[PDB]
Design an enzyme around this catalytic site. Structure first.
Site, short mmCIF file in Angstrom:
data_model
loop_
_atom_site.label_atom_id
_atom_site.label_comp_id
_atom_site.label_asym_id
_atom_site.label_seq_id
_atom_site.Cartn_x
_atom_site.Cartn_y
_atom_site.Cartn_z
N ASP A 356 -74.84 -19.83 -1.78
CA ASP A 356 -75.63 -21.34 -3.22
C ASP A 356 -74.71 -20.73 -4.48
OD1 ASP A 356 -77.45 -22.97 -4.92
OD2 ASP A 356 -75.87 -24.17 -3.40
N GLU A 396 -70.27 -19.64 -2.31
CA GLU A 396 -69.73 -21.35 -2.23
C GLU A 396 -68.67 -20.92 -3.28
OE1 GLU A 396 -71.93 -23.83 -4.81
OE2 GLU A 396 -71.11 -25.68 -3.72
C1 LIG Z 1 -72.73 -29.74 -6.01
C2 LIG Z 1 -72.27 -28.61 -6.59
O1 LIG Z 1 -71.80 -28.69 -7.74
C3 LIG Z 1 -70.89 -27.49 -8.40
O2 LIG Z 1 -69.75 -28.14 -7.92
C4 LIG Z 1 -68.11 -28.15 -8.62
C5 LIG Z 1 -67.42 -26.68 -8.19
O3 LIG Z 1 -68.03 -25.81 -9.80
C6 LIG Z 1 -66.40 -27.83 -9.75
O4 LIG Z 1 -64.75 -26.87 -9.40
C7 LIG Z 1 -65.46 -29.32 -9.48
O5 LIG Z 1 -65.59 -28.77 -8.26
O6 LIG Z 1 -66.80 -29.49 -9.03
C8 LIG Z 1 -67.58 -30.10 -8.40
C9 LIG Z 1 -69.35 -30.47 -8.11
O7 LIG Z 1 -68.16 -31.65 -7.50
C10 LIG Z 1 -71.42 -26.58 -8.68
O8 LIG Z 1 -71.32 -25.27 -8.91
C11 LIG Z 1 -72.00 -26.46 -6.69
O9 LIG Z 1 -72.58 -25.24 -6.99
C12 LIG Z 1 -72.68 -27.20 -6.05
N1 LIG Z 1 -73.05 -26.76 -5.16
C13 LIG Z 1 -74.13 -26.07 -4.39
C14 LIG Z 1 -75.68 -26.79 -5.54
C15 LIG Z 1 -76.86 -27.38 -5.65
C16 LIG Z 1 -77.84 -25.79 -6.04
O10 LIG Z 1 -77.68 -25.71 -5.33
C17 LIG Z 1 -76.45 -27.99 -4.29
O11 LIG Z 1 -76.85 -29.62 -4.91
C18 LIG Z 1 -78.39 -29.80 -5.07
O12 LIG Z 1 -79.48 -29.57 -5.81
C19 LIG Z 1 -78.34 -31.02 -6.82
C20 LIG Z 1 -78.95 -30.78 -8.42
O13 LIG Z 1 -80.51 -31.05 -8.18
C21 LIG Z 1 -78.30 -32.01 -6.50
O14 LIG Z 1 -77.54 -32.99 -6.94
C22 LIG Z 1 -77.72 -34.70 -6.62
O15 LIG Z 1 -76.49 -34.76 -7.47
C23 LIG Z 1 -76.67 -36.19 -8.39
C24 LIG Z 1 -75.79 -36.86 -8.32
O16 LIG Z 1 -74.68 -37.74 -7.66
C25 LIG Z 1 -77.83 -36.85 -9.05
O17 LIG Z 1 -77.83 -38.11 -9.03
C26 LIG Z 1 -79.24 -36.06 -8.20
O18 LIG Z 1 -79.88 -35.78 -9.31
C27 LIG Z 1 -78.88 -34.30 -8.07
O19 LIG Z 1 -80.49 -34.19 -7.11
C28 LIG Z 1 -78.16 -32.21 -4.72
O20 LIG Z 1 -78.23 -33.22 -3.93
C29 LIG Z 1 -78.51 -30.80 -4.43
O21 LIG Z 1 -77.00 -30.97 -2.86
C30 LIG Z 1 -75.40 -28.08 -3.97
O22 LIG Z 1 -76.07 -29.17 -2.17
C31 LIG Z 1 -75.10 -27.15 -3.43
O23 LIG Z 1 -73.85 -26.96 -2.51
#
Ligand SMILES: C[C@H]1O[C@H](O[C@H]2[C@H](O)[C@@H](O)[C@@H](O)O[C@@H]2CO)[C@H](O)[C@@H](O)[C@@H]1N[C@H]1C=C(CO)[C@@H](O[C@H]2O[C@H](CO)[C@@H](O[C@@H]3O[C@H](CO)[C@@H](O)[C@H](O)[C@H]3O)[C@H](O)[C@H]2O)[C@H](O)[C@H]1O
Ligand SMILES: OC[C@H]1O[C@H](O[C@H]2[C@H](O)[C@@H](O)[C@@H](O[C@H]3[C@H](O)[C@@H](O)[C@@H](O[C@H]4[C@H](O)[C@@H](O)[C@@H](O)O[C@@H]4CO)O[C@@H]3CO)O[C@@H]2CO)[C@H](O)[C@@H](O)[C@@H]1O
Ligand SMILES: C[C@H]1O[C@H](O[C@H]2[C@H](O)[C@@H](O)[C@@H](O)O[C@@H]2CO)[C@H](O)[C@@H](O)[C@@H]1N[C@@H]1C=C(CO)[C@@H](O)[C@H](O)[C@H]1O
Ligand SMILES: C[C@H]1O[C@H](O[C@H]2[C@H](O)[C@@H](O)[C@@H](O)O[C@@H]2CO)[C@H](O)[C@@H](O)[C@@H]1N[C@H]1C=C(CO)[C@@H](O)[C@H](O)[C@H]1O
Ligand SMILES: OC[C@H]1O[C@H](O[C@H]2[C@H](O)[C@@H](O)[C@@H](O)O[C@@H]2CO)[C@H](O)[C@@H](O)[C@@H]1O
Ligand SMILES: [Ca+2]
Ligand SMILES: [Ca+2]
Ligand SMILES: [Ca+2]
Length: 637
Positions: A356, A396
């Site tokens: 992650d 990821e």
């Molecule tokens: C979610 C994702 O974001 C980044 O990804 C980018 C990517 O790098 C870019 O190239 C481009 O494509 O955009 C994407 C995003 O769409 C990041 O680099 C990734 O690592 C990330 N995914 C992983 C990491 C996270 C942190 O461990 C995980 O998310 C979890 O925590 C988040 C933060 O709180 C939560 O996000 C929610 O988002 C909503 C928005 O709708 C907010 O309102 C809310 O407050 C947040 O809580 C999420 O629910 C959690 O799952 C993720 O799951 C990993 O896969």
């Protein structure tokens, strides 16, 4: 066709499939013999040009005619690249008198390419089970409540001043007034996963399960880790994990299975004892005392309120990896009793990790994508593979993950957003994976796939995590507008392409859902049966992929890219089989003359559309098959 000062591109071909590469994953002492294919009697000479990283120079290997294919339509030219430990990059120069063409990972070319060459990474190995398996991803809380005694209830506890809310199975995932979306629970757990193992490995046929976080954490997604050494009470205890692992590895309930865990190593939750922001533990965390024994596990700009984190979220304090030999690198992967090795070693023996936010892992609060970040994932690989060489490492990353894979010293593969998810979404649904208007033609789709496929070593390609949807993007069914037929085409494609077909729980039956958290809906089990058209095909398809190695590790050759009728046909083949896949992305039926001669399918030989059971005969190098709009055939022999 002849010696006429003209190299015919349509006759040319090569990739690291069985027919062309005698050693796709060689050791320091193994020679790589390459075979180039051309129309018979079309060229005058051919050569292999490779860059050897050992002396930083180009080397030349003239090729020699090896043989003709069974149909006497093609010539096979061979050449061998000497065995050594060094990484090598090669391409082909093809000559026919005054005409010269080049060929590499990106196909034919009139001018000499400087990128997209084929790779030769000595001693680099991606576990084969990952290469040949089918994966099924599960977001724990939303799959199946197999034990209602460990359920989180409304008010059960509070996080950062918010009480937890419990939902009725099937209800909306959105928190009601007064609660938070991160604190909404449906009850899914490990016992649930174990009880539905039959649905996974049999009803569908999948042999690999990938779980989003399952360790002690206050949210429902659990990326805010509070304790890596304990299974979150809501999902069960460590003992529950063991029984699940045993039941997954068991071949008494279906195919031998493998478990892949989500490793959230870039950051910790703010409620983890090392940080202990809300003081849930007697010990003193980094946030409470600069004298804390874990102070240096994090990076503070202005203690204690302003610190490094994951994209600005204060609940996810960023870990400071410091330098090699640091305590942090030890607790995550170096120590025998580290997070990565503890679960990789008995009595757990999981089969792999999903890295992650892997691009950020760094030291001193920096954002990664730098030298230190890569140095770290290299030590990570030695630690993992040291404990079990067949334990997968999937990082990821949403773009080109070449920096973390192209040198065989970091990850085995990556989340194929750019090479699979996006191109598929835009081609079939006309939307990107976030449901924004973005469409591509068949020609454009085939090109997109080839360019991204060329970003990686062949074994990495075969190990890429190919999903139609996932916990961070909109659901395919929603992007499809509900048209279950688009899901059919998507599935058929997914199960016949290069890479590990990965099913995001619920997609197999057509589940919908928008942006987080609505893409993490509870699983509707009344739809989880072969009575669902989508579910039936999924199983049909999975069975088919497991039947032919050619679909998991064979070559890939484009056969048709018709923008008029919207037909896309490609072939997967090796030493045993030849599979012609015909896809119809139109909303009307089409009769396609599939040019199976390109796969050297003999005339008179029969082929079978493993999707219908209907047989066909190869005459004049063709096979005529009619296919419904948004559907496809899988002509195999
Ligand atoms: C979610 C994702 O974001 C980044 O990804 C980018 C990517 O790098 C870019 O190239 C481009 O494509 O955009 C994407 C995003 O769409 C990041 O680099 C990734 O690592 C990330 N995914 C992983 C990491 C996270 C942190 O461990 C995980 O998310 C979890 O925590 C988040 C933060 O709180 C939560 O996000 C929610 O988002 C909503 C928005 O709708 C907010 O309102 C809310 O407050 C947040 O809580 C999420 O629910 C959690 O799952 C993720 O799951 C990993 O896969
Ligand atoms: O995201 C990172 C980049 O990933 C991709 O780059 C790949 C290429 O696609 C591959 O073909 C390969 O490139 C080799 C190349 O084959 C080899 O000849 C040699 O090329 C250069 C060398 O880099 C340079 O230092 C100098 O010596 O000249 C040589 C030839 O003129 O080395 C290349 C890489 O070392 O590998 C790269 C990276 O792994 C992608 O195409 C890029 O867009 C992307 O930025
Ligand atoms: C080959 C190329 O395919 C995709 O690119 C898409 C664009 O995203 C889209 O906006 C439009 O321009 O159509 C393109 C299809 O050609 C894919 O998204 C790209 O990543 C990919 N680009 C090559 C591969 C690498 C991966 O990004 C890059 O590093 C490299 O520079 C590209 O040649
Ligand atoms: C060298 C020659 O190899 C191949 O020819 C073989 C045929 O394919 C077989 O069917 C059978 O007849 O054996 C032949 C070998 O003698 C290939 O098809 C030919 O194209 C290839 N000859 C090319 C290379 C030469 C070297 O420059 C040229 O002189 C010649 O004109 C080319 O055709
Ligand atoms: O009617 C459902 C059916 O519609 C389409 O079938 C087309 C057919 O392919 C066309 O050639 C023409 O006959 O019109 C038919 C219906 O209008 C789709 O191909 C198919 O997805 C769908 O099931
Ligand atoms: Ca010619
Ligand atoms: Ca439960
Ligand atoms: Ca405390």
């Amino acid at each position: 066709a002849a010696n006429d000062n003209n190299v015919e591109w349509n006759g040319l071909f090569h990739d690291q499939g069985p027919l062309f590469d005698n050693a796709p994953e060689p050791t320091s002492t193994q020679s790589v013999t390459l075979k180039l294919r051309t129309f018979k009697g079309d060229i005058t000479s051919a050569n292999i040009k490779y860059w050897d990283t050992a002396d930083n120079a180009f080397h030349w290997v003239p090729m020699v005619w090896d043989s003709n294919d069974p149909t006497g339509t093609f010539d096979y030219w061979k050449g061998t690249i000497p065995a050594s430990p060094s990484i090598k990059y090669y391409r082909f120069q093809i000559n026919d008198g005054t005409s010269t063409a080049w060929y590499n990972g990106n196909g034919p070319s009139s001018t000499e390419p400087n990128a997209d060459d084929f790779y030769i990474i000595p001693n680099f190995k991606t576990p084969d089970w990952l290469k040949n398996g089918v994966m099924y991803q599960i977001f724990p809380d939303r799959f199946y409540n197999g034990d209602s005694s460990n359920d989180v209830q409304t008010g059960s506890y509070t996080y950062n001043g918010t009480p937890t809310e419990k939902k009725a199975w099937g209800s909306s995932v959105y928190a009601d007034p007064g609660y938070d979306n991160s604190l909404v629970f449906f009850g899914g757990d490990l016992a649930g996963i174990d009880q539905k193992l039959g649905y996974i490995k049999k009803t569908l046929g999948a042999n690999i399960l990938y779980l989003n976080p399952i360790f002690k954490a206050p949210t429902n997604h659990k990326y805010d880790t509070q304790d890596y050494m304990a299974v979150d009470p809501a999902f069960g205890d460590n003992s529950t994990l063991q029984t699940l692992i045993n039941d997954i590895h068991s071949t008494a309930n279906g195919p031998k299975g493998y478990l892949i865990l989500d490793g959230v190593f870039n950051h910790t939750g703010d409620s983890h004892p090392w940080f202990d922001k809300y003081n849930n533990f007697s010990s003193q965390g980094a946030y409470e005392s600069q004298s804390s024994p874990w102070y240096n596990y994090y990076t503070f700009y202005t203690w204690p309120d302003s610190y490094a984190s994951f994209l600005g979220f204060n609940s996810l304090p960023k870990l400071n990896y410091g330098n090699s030999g640091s305590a942090v690198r030890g607790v995550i992967y170096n120590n025998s009793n580290s997070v990565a090795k503890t679960y990789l070693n008995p009595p757990y023996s999981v089969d792999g990790w999903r890295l992650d936010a892997a691009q950020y892992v760094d030291a001193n609060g920096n954002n990664g994508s730098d030298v230190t970040n890569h140095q770290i994932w290299s030590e990570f690989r030695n630690a993992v593979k040291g404990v079990n060489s067949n334990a997968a490492i999937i990082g990821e990353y949403w773009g080109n993950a070449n920096p973390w894979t192209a040198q065989g010293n970091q990850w085995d593969a990556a989340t194929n957003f750019d090479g699979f998810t996006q191109p598929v979404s835009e081609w079939i649904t006309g939307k990107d994976y976030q449901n924004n208007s973005a469409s591509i033609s068949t020609t454009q789709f085939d090109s997109w796939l080839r360019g991204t496929r060329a970003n990686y070593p062949t074994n990495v390609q075969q190990s890429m995590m190919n999903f139609l949807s996932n916990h961070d993007i909109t659901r395919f069914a929603t992007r499809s507008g509900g048209d279950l037929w688009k899901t059919y085409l998507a599935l058929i494609f997914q199960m016949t392409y290069v890479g590990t077909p990965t099913i995001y729980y619920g997609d197999e039956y057509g589940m919908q859902g928008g942006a987080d958290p609505d893409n993490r809906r509870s699983f509707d089990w009344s739809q989880a049966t072969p009575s669902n058209s989508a579910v039936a095909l999924t199983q049909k398809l999975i069975t088919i992929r497991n039947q032919y190695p050619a679909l998991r590790t064979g070559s890939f050759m484009t056969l048709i890219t018709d923008d008029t009728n919207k037909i896309y046909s490609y072939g997967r083949f090796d030493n045993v089989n030849r599979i012609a896949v015909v896809l119809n992305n139109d909303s009307v039926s089409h009769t396609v003359n599939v040019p199976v001669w390109q796969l050297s399918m003999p005339n008179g030989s029969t082929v079978t559309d493993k999707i219908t059971g209907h047989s066909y005969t190869v005459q004049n190098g063709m096979v005529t098959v009619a296919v419904d709009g948004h559907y496809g055939a899988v002509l195999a022999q």
